[PDB]
Copies of this chain bind each other. A is one copy, B any other.
Amino acid sequence: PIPTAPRENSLMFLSTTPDDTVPAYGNVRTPPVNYLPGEITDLLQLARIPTLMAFGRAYVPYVAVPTQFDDKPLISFPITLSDPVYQNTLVGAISSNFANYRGCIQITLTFCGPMMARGKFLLSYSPPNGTQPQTLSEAMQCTYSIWDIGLNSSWTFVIPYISPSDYRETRAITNSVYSADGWFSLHKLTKITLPPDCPQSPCILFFASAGEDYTLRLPVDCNPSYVF
């Protein structure tokens, strides 16, 4: 007999022990699954797949561009992965089941107007300031890129990972700088020039994918509110 000393946490069920348990019904040969393609190894393979965002004008995956508009962002949503423009993206839904993120959010646009439409947009990203930038001059002073409408119908804006910490909180409980990372804003630089007999107010279809250096950490309990 080997003298052992069992610890204080004996006979304890911890739900996430990194360890196996006793086989009750072993020696079972499963049917092979070598016929199935598309095996997922990591869930960041699917956060990198761009999915539609949602925008309150009945929520809408796109943004219509009105022919007369002020010196405001045409759409502007905060860089917080708990914001409802991210609830039904595979980035913001997989990230809502974790506790940290690290890396670049990627916003892809798709101009869904006619082919005869031209126009330029200023895609800006502001780090968290005291006040959200609204003027085209204030959005010019941030991280921006001008997208020309032409033969190619997309522009993948990559939101930089600007953070005081190596990880950021993926849920703004208390709305601090460790969870809210500023604002993305779409201004129209030059107005959209259409010929006669073309539809007014074209639509920019938004996407939200993960960058190639996007990372998630600390799996948390789910929100079961989808099933209610």
Contact = CB atoms under 8 A, between A and B. Distances in A.
Interface string A1-45: 111111111111110101001111110000100000000000000
A212 interface: no
Nearest to A10: B5
| Chain A facing B: main interface SS | loop
A3 B7 contact: yes
Interface in A92-139: none
A21 B6 CA distance: 12
Contacts of A23: 18
Interface size class of A (residues with CB under 8 A): 20 to 34
Nearest to A9: B22
30 contacts: A1-B2, A1-B3, A1-B5, A2-B2, A2-B3, A2-B4, A2-B5, A3-B4, A3-B5, A3-B6, A3-B7, A4-B4, A4-B6, A5-B6, A5-B9, A5-B10, A6-B10, A6-B11, A7-B11, A7-B21, A7-B22, A8-B11, A8-B12, A9-B21, A10-B11, A14-B22, A14-B24, A16-B24, A18-B23, A31-B165
A71 interface: no
A29 B106 CA distance: 25
A26 B16 CA distance: 10
A10 B11 CA distance: 8
Contacts of A166: 31
Nearest to A24: B14
A171 to B, nearest CB: 18
Given A3-B5, A7-B3, A26 B18 contact: yes
Contacts of A12: 8
- In order of increasing CB-CB distance, the 5 nearest A-B pairs are A1-B3, A4-B4, A3-B5, A2-B2, A2-B4
A22 B166 CA distance: 27
